[PDB]
Amino acid sequence: MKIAVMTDSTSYLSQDLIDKYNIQIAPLSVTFDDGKNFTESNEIAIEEFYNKMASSQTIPTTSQPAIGEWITKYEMLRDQGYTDIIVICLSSGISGSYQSSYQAGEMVEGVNVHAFDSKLAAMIEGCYVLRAIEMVEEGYEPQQIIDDLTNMREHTGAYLIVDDLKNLQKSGRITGAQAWVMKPVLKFEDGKIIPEEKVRTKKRAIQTLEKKVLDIVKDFEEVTLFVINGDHFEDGQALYKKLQDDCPSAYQVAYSETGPVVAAHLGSGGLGLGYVGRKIRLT
Numbered sequence: 001m002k003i004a005v006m007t008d009s010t011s012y013l014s015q016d017l018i019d020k021y022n023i024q025i026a027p028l029s030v031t032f033d034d035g036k037n038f039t040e041s042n043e044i045a046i047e048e049f050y051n052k053m054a055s056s057q058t059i060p061t062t063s064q065p066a067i068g069e070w071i072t073k074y075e076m077l078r079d080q081g082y083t084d085i086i087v088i089c090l091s092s093g094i095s096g097s098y099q100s101s102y103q104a105g106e107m108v109e110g111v112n113v114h115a116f117d118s119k120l121a122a123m124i125e126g127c128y129v130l131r132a133i134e135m136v137e138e139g140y141e142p143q144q145i146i147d148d149l150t151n152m153r154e155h156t157g158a159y160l161i162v163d164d165l166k167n168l169q170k171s172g173r174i175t176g177a178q179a180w181v182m183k184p185v186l187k188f189e190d191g192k193i194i195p196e197e198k199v200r201t202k203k204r205a206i207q208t209l210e211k212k213v214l215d216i217v218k219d220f221e222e223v224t225l226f227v228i229n230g231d232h233f234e235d236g237q238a239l240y241k242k243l244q245d246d247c248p249s250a251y252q253v254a255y256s257e258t259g260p261v262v263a264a265h266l267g268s269g270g271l272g273l274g275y276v277g278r279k280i281r282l283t
């Protein structure tokens with residue numbers, strides 16, 4: 001038994017962790033109105049995508065990884081001697097990436113595929129990858145890892161804000177809150193993005209983000225917080241630094257940024273604050 005752990009590009013893991021653990025990536029892509037296609041990777045500068053998304057009369061379109069791209073990654077890992085693959089996926093409620101990975105796992109032969117619906121995105125989805133890799137080192141077997149991630153999913157969530165709900169409404173990735181389409185505060189619930197609160201100012205939106213998450217994680221034996229920043233770099237840093245001061249060092253407070261696919265649906269000002277009821281190994 002040789003267990004591998006892979007994921008899609010929306011987990012937004014750093015290249016250090018991808019190089020160190022040899023994490024294979026089934027990438028997602030973005031397509032602009034001028035015909036330019038771009039698959040997600042750590043090579044493209046994220047601020048270059050934000051400049052292009054701002055310089056586009058049409059909101060760009062994203063695409064999940066094709067089922068043939070999961071199969072190619074499955075066959076490559078199988079041909080390297082791997083017998084079991086743990087696949088961490090973008091939330092099935094916002095993308096068909098998980099179902100594509102799930103169906104590809106049924107089609108590829110000679111290897112066992114264990115697809116997991118993380119029900120979230122960004123580095124919060126990547127924390128499942130890091131938890132799975134940690135358990136593989138510990139000698140666990142795929143079903144034990146899947147059961148551990150399922151329990152981890154019950155104490156994992158995210159709140160987020162956006163400048164305008166036009167990017168999410170165009171993509172249909174926002175459920176409800178049609179009267180809102182002030183600053184909205186959204187949240188992930190069962191893998192979907194739903195409204196949570198409508199606040200008066202962007203400043204009180206970020207304050208609301210911290211209050212909602214801090215009120216939840218105080219009942220957790222372990223806490224890993226993740227600031228997922230957008231194009232406004234000062235928003236994520238101010239929240240990240242304020243969390244470092246307001247939270248005890250027993251809390252693991254980390255920082256990360258969105259990629260092109262997530263930014264295409266959030267639009268400008270896409271700031272998020274995620275949490276996991278575990279102490280994830282980030283090294």
Ligand SMILES: CCCCCCCCCCCCCCCC(=O)O
Nearest residue numbers: 062063064095121158265272273274
């Ligand atoms: C704090 C962490 C939460 C951050 C939330 C980021 C995800 C919001 C928008 C997701 C929609 C993009 C998925 C579409 C992919 C596809 O085209 O299949």
